[PDB]
Design a protein around this ligand. Sequence first.
Ligand SMILES: C[C@@H]1CCCC[C@H](O)[C@@H]2CC[C@H]2CN2C[C@@]3(CCCc4cc(Cl)ccc43)COc3ccc(cc32)C(=O)NS1(=O)=O
Length: 156
Amino acid sequence: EDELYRQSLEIISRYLREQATGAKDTKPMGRSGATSRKALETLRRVGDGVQRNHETAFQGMLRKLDIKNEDDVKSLSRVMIHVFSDGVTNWGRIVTLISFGAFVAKHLKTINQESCIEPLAESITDVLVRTKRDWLVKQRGWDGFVEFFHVEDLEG
Ligand SMILES: C[C@@H]1CCCC[C@H](O)[C@@H]2CC[C@H]2CN2C[C@@]3(CCCc4cc(Cl)ccc43)COc3ccc(cc32)C(=O)NS1(=O)=O
């Protein structure tokens, strides 16, 4: 019924799990599957670049956060609200939010805390959707995300 939340959670959870495990989830998407598929494909293309372009800053922040367990992962919501929500919103900042989430998810895999990845994805989704719904709706949601990052085919 809250379709934006459900769709956001599915896209973000899939990207974080895919980043952590290195395998695609072959299960069908829920509702709005065509857009969700394209959003995940976009998030791959763009987020993978973001994590490399900001490698030094990402590594620095990860080290600072010292994520070891469920309690540490739970504390991240407050930090996301502080850093992401309290600023002007644009798609770039949303991708950085999600891309750093994937960076944290990979870290969780490396320390054998894979069970924390889904709660992490839920926390990121809560912060994004519950603090930026108005902006997301005005920007056409995940359809807008896909449109914004669409790259035209090169001739020849
Ligand atoms: C140009 C900027 C990107 C480069 C700067 C990156 C920055 O130095 C920190 C390295 C992690 C970045 C801090 N966080 C990361 C943070 C804040 C730290 C905790 C956290 C945890 C998770 Cl699971 C996901 C995100 C986050 C909030 O999300 C951010 C959203 C936008 C920007 C930065 C955010 C953010 O600053 N995005 S931006 O304006 O596009």
